[PDB]
Scaffold this active site. Structure first.
Site, PDB file in Angstrom:
ATOM      1  N   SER A 189      37.259  40.761  46.174  1.00  0.00           N
ATOM      2  CA  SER A 189      37.334  41.639  44.993  1.00  0.00           C
ATOM      3  C   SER A 189      36.270  41.214  43.982  1.00  0.00           C
ATOM      4  O   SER A 189      35.073  41.265  44.318  1.00  0.00           O
ATOM      5  CB  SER A 189      38.780  41.641  44.475  1.00  0.00           C
TER       6      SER A 189
ATOM      7  N   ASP B 290      41.961  51.505  49.416  1.00  0.00           N
ATOM      8  CA  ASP B 290      41.371  50.779  48.286  1.00  0.00           C
ATOM      9  C   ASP B 290      40.423  51.716  47.545  1.00  0.00           C
ATOM     10  O   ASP B 290      39.593  52.369  48.200  1.00  0.00           O
ATOM     11  CB  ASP B 290      40.625  49.570  48.843  1.00  0.00           C
TER      12      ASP B 290
ATOM     13  N   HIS C 112      43.827  47.298  48.777  1.00  0.00           N
ATOM     14  CA  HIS C 112      43.124  46.235  48.065  1.00  0.00           C
ATOM     15  C   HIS C 112      44.016  45.014  47.902  1.00  0.00           C
ATOM     16  O   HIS C 112      45.202  45.135  47.589  1.00  0.00           O
ATOM     17  CB  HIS C 112      42.696  46.719  46.683  1.00  0.00           C
TER      18      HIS C 112
END
Lengths: 51, 310
Positions: free
Chosen positions: B155, B252, B282
């Site tokens: 991320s 995501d 995600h």
């Protein structure tokens, strides 16, 4: 029987040692370390009628 | 594939409460929250050492993971945790690093970079590069192979790994063998958002409102949206960067952002493999051992790291 390994107090979901449980399954919160009684819901298993 | 069944159960309960009021949400408020992720299985490794890395003006905590059954000189991964540049730390991502070390067959250095809004952009970027340089310059002390040191992260941490590779290209080092980018936030032209940014903006834990909130905490102004240290996909010359493996998740909002970075790397002549995990969201690495799909996917990512550094 089992014990709540983790439970999100605000969002109302968690796991019981592992099986999923949300706040609607309780008969409002569970806390980590509590011993509970429940039915299995194997319709990733899930708990039902948690005491 | 549909959503992984355990993840589905979490999301169904998450989406019952209304979205936060992002215009008034504070960082100290958001960090005071209980985290959405529960503690998961820690795979065993030979040794875990935590220590303070002293840099000019600040000290960064580091956790070093040495896996069982590997012999020097070790391959290594400098790893930057996710959390939108605002949250996360060594403990939130400890189970991820253990899998990466154990199944990747590499020493992992997990780096605690400075967090926003207390330390705004580009503090984390400077930390990410300076920590890689600190470790690489000490390769012999750590028994590392200097030709097999990778960077990686998830991320916002994948953002930092991608930007670190750019800074290392500009500065002639240190040598990076591989970039492991796990659902990274590598940026896009705000006038042409990739489809997933809008398709997956609600309902899948990481939301469009959350993304804008992280960015407001991290950046000094929205004029920085196209700064390549924030959006490395916009860096004018990506040629010569280390080969990359990119993992995206189907549900995501960042899915097609990762795909865009793979496209841009490929068009600049960099070897890149990208794999989309069709049943995941995600942040799925933090559901390791709890979600069967997440478990399988993180182990596969770790084996990609193993093959890259063999």
């Amino acid at each position: 029987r089992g014990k709540v390994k983790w439970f999100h107090d605000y969002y109302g979901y968690g796991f019981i040692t592992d099986v999923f449980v949300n706040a609607d399954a309780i008969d409002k919160t569970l806390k980590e370390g509590q011993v509970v009684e429940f039915e299995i819901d194997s319709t990733a298993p899930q708990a039902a009628h948690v005491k | 594939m549909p959503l992984d069944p355990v993840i589905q159960q979490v999301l169904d309960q998450l989406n019952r409460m209304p979205a936060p009021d992002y215009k008034h949400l504070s960082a100290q408020q958001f960090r005071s929250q209980q985290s959405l992720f529960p503690p998961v299985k820690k795979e065993p490794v030979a040794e875990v050492r935590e220590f303070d890395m002293d840099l000019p003006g600040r000290t960064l905590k580091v956790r070093m993971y040495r896996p069982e059954g590997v012999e020097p000189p070790y391959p290594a991964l400098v790893y930057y945790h996710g959390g939108g540049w605002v949250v996360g730390d060594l403990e939130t991502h400890d189970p991820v690093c253990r899998v990466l070390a154990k199944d990747g067959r590499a020493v992992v250095f997990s780096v605690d970079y400075r967090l926003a809004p207390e330390h705004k952009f580009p503090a984390a970027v400077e930390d990410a590069y300076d920590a890689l340089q600190w470790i690489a310059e000490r390769a012999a002390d750590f028994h590392l192979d200097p030709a097999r040191i990778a960077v990686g992260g998830d991320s916002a941490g994948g953002n930092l790994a991608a930007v670190t590779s750019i800074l290392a290209k500009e500065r002639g080092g240190p040598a990076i063998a591989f970039q492991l980018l796990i659902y990274p936030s590598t940026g896009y032209d705000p006038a042409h958002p990739p489809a997933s940014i809008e398709e997956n903006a609600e309902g899948y834990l990481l939301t469009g409102g959350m993304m804008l909130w992280f960015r407001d905490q991290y950046l000094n102004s929205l004029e920085e949206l196209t700064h390549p240290w924030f959006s490395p996909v916009l860096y004018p010359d990506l040629s010569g960067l280390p080969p990359a493996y990119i993992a995206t998740a189907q549900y995501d909002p960042l899915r097609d952002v990762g795909k865009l970075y793979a496209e841009a790397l490929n068009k600049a002549g960099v070897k890149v493999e990208i794999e989309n995990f069709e049943d995941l969201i995600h942040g799925f690495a933090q559901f390791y051992s709890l979600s069967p799909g997440a478990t399988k996917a993180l182990v596969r990512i770790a084996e990609k790291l193993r093959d890259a550094l063999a």
